[PDB]
Design a protein around this ligand. Sequence first.
Ligand SMILES: *[C@@H]1O[C@H](CO)[C@@H](O[C@@H]2O[C@H](CO)[C@@H](O)[C@H](O)[C@H]2NC(C)=O)[C@H](O)[C@H]1NC(C)=O
Ligand SMILES: *[C@@H]1O[C@H](CO)[C@@H](O[C@@H]2O[C@H](CO)[C@@H](O)[C@H](O)[C@H]2NC(C)=O)[C@H](O)[C@H]1NC(C)=O
Ligand SMILES: *[C@@H]1O[C@H](CO)[C@@H](O[C@@H]2O[C@H](CO)[C@@H](O)[C@H](O)[C@H]2NC(C)=O)[C@H](O)[C@H]1NC(C)=O
Ligand SMILES: *[C@@H]1O[C@H](CO)[C@@H](O[C@@H]2O[C@H](CO)[C@@H](O)[C@H](O)[C@H]2NC(C)=O)[C@H](O)[C@H]1NC(C)=O
Ligand SMILES: *[C@@H]1O[C@H](CO)[C@@H](O[C@@H]2O[C@H](CO)[C@@H](O)[C@H](O)[C@H]2NC(C)=O)[C@H](O)[C@H]1NC(C)=O
Ligand SMILES: *[C@@H]1O[C@H](CO)[C@@H](O)[C@H](O)[C@H]1NC(C)=O
Lengths: 98, 597
Amino acid sequence: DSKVGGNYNYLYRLFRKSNLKPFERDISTEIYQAGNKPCNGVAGFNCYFPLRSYGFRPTYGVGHQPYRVVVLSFELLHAPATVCGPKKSTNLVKNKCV
Amino acid sequence: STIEEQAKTFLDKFNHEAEDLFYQSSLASWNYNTNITEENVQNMNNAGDKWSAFLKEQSTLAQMYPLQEIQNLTVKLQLQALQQNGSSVLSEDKSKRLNTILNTMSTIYSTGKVCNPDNPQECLLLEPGLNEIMANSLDYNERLWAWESWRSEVGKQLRPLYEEYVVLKNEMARANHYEDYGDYWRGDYEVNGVDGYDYSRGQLIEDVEHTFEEIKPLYEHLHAYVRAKLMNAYPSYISPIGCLPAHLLGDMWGRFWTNLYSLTVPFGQKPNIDVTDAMVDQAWDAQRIFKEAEKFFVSVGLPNMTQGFWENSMLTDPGNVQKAVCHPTAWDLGKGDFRILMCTKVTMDDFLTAHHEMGHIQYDMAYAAQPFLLRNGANEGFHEAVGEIMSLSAATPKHLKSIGLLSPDFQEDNETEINFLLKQALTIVGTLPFTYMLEKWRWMVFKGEIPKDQWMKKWWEMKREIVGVVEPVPHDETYCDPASLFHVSNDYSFIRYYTRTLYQFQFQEALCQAAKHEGPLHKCDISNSTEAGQKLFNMLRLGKSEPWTLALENVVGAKNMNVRPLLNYFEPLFTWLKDQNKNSFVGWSTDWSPYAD
Ligand SMILES: *[C@@H]1O[C@H](CO)[C@@H](O[C@@H]2O[C@H](CO)[C@@H](O)[C@H](O)[C@H]2NC(C)=O)[C@H](O)[C@H]1NC(C)=O
Ligand SMILES: *[C@@H]1O[C@H](CO)[C@@H](O[C@@H]2O[C@H](CO)[C@@H](O)[C@H](O)[C@H]2NC(C)=O)[C@H](O)[C@H]1NC(C)=O
Ligand SMILES: *[C@@H]1O[C@H](CO)[C@@H](O[C@@H]2O[C@H](CO)[C@@H](O)[C@H](O)[C@H]2NC(C)=O)[C@H](O)[C@H]1NC(C)=O
Ligand SMILES: *[C@@H]1O[C@H](CO)[C@@H](O[C@@H]2O[C@H](CO)[C@@H](O)[C@H](O)[C@H]2NC(C)=O)[C@H](O)[C@H]1NC(C)=O
Ligand SMILES: *[C@@H]1O[C@H](CO)[C@@H](O[C@@H]2O[C@H](CO)[C@@H](O)[C@H](O)[C@H]2NC(C)=O)[C@H](O)[C@H]1NC(C)=O
Ligand SMILES: *[C@@H]1O[C@H](CO)[C@@H](O)[C@H](O)[C@H]1NC(C)=O
């Protein structure tokens, strides 16, 4: 995922009104407002964009190279039965008390 | 919007952008330095241009936040560092005039050409040969020529430019609520309102003039010894109650007396410690020496190398014709991407330089967590200070015979120890009078005490009074001798090389008093200890986030620089010099002249 000369595709928000809610999602691009004067959607003196980009390359140290993260989450609402683990087996002998 | 968040909330953005851009610029630069081509200069100049323009725009923007409504210390310090106008407070045409005068001064210094009176066709530059003539020749006439020439052709051109340079810099500094320029330099040691750790801009002069008073008892004896020894190579040229002629010290300006070791060795038939043939007889490459340095560093309790430093760094010069300036340097491109650029040879001197550079590498590894504007030493001095103690601790015979480069039965004696100690004190305590003299002279001429028709007379009476050296030829007021020193004609501060010499031995003693050492300090090692590593690392990781007078007190325990460790390091040499001068005359009389006889 790291290409020489900067790979500016992956963004990460670093300005927001208040912290998120668990498992919630926010994709807006409304210009932040830290001061007391309303912005009217123009960057500049106190009125910045909310999205930056990781510029991943190859000559970085550990702790700055791009890591890929996946998370699994289960939840058992009300279903009688659903996807379970895999089954296994043995054989099928005959004429024996088993 | 608490009148401050508006500051921090900015600070963040700035932080990020800054770091990023800077990195782009720096990679660009390392490139050009390791692979000299014609296009790479262009590939790096525009990166530096974009970086400078971005930083000056952020500096012009940061002004809108006043500096008294801030309450948190770190954000206030970051803003105070960024909010600096620097130049560009002047009239616009005067700014271009200042750039022209600076660049013309630098050029006239760089491309100086002096030519013999017997052969004016082909002649000598400064760097190739002039230093060699002033260092290795032995005849009074040739040395006097090589000395008077460079000050008669490069000292005469620089005065009418330095005159305007002084007043321009003063008018610059006088717009930022400062009263002269020297104060704008001393402003690096300033700390305001931290309830006891404060350090006024003035008290630096007080310390300096208060710590130079305890050095003279040793410097006087060293001067007496060096003089009574130089009275052998040039018979009947020096007086036993006089000073030294400037053109007999060992280089162009008399800054390092290290080249006097050939004339003033105490025991000229007992060679010092030197691992140079034992290395090559073991087939050591450039990889092995750096592996040794990393092993030593990890032995005390510091982290390994970042595993990105063994593939990117350039430890040996490129085989084919690949012009890359061979001058060791430790790069911190940021983002945890550290590198070392140096053209290592298989010599114990490069073996010590590797330690001295990995010192800076470790010091940069430590504070990589602070905000980007606080990624430096505590002040200008701590960097090379914390660097040099590694080289001072890796050159002792103990650490050598514990690595496989000295014969196990190598028995050291007091003769070799006095030899080594004089070789050290010819460089360490030799440069301090010159350094303090030059810095005080510059502060004086900047504050306006010295009228501009009394520069050279004052400079020479100072060289007569403080350091103990006298000019060989009179010089009227069409000259300027100090403008012939690289750190003067290029607008470089020159007090760090005086605070470093003290911080060095303070750190040495403070550290290896934890390694439970018992003998004299000049054999002391910091290997295999873990308390020493912790004591050092609890200061390495602060950066600028705390006032330097706390970075000290967390290592040695004092709140200022103290010269006592230095004298405690040289006590054996001093005990010897007190005996070898039973019959000479210590000190010097400022009345003698080399021409008034
Ligand atoms: C040093 O810089 C020069 C200038 O670009 C490099 O020379 C060319 O570099 C390009 C970059 O990919 C190559 O495609 C060419 O084949 C190179 N040509 C020649 C004649 O060198 C040079 O490669 C650089 N040196 C190193 C070690 O990277
Ligand atoms: C701004 O000041 C506050 C306190 O005035 C700092 O808060 C401390 O932050 C450190 C780590 O940065 C924590 O270990 C402490 O627990 C915090 N103190 C308290 C009382 O919670 C804050 O760090 C400062 N800002 C910056 C950027 O350093
Ligand atoms: C830095 O230079 C500026 C001039 O460019 C000085 O003047 C201030 O400029 C800012 C914005 O440019 C104004 O908001 C202030 O009102 C100006 N006057 C002040 C701050 O007294 C500024 O003073 C200089 N910085 C410092 C620390 O003196
Ligand atoms: C190095 O050590 C040796 C032995 O410890 C010193 O030799 C003695 O030095 C004292 C000092 O005056 C003399 O009185 C003795 O006569 C010496 N011993 C002999 C057997 O002659 C030696 O002096 C020390 N080096 C220096 C420079 O003092
Ligand atoms: C001090 O550090 C050295 C450096 O590793 C240690 O050296 C080892 O010493 C043992 C016995 O003295 C030898 O068998 C090893 O071969 C040495 N290692 C190397 C790499 O040379 C030494 O052990 C340390 N001191 C103590 C007390 O542990
Ligand atoms: C340092 O590197 C060596 C590789 O020789 C390894 O054995 C050691 O565990 C490393 N130590 C640390 C603290 O990473």
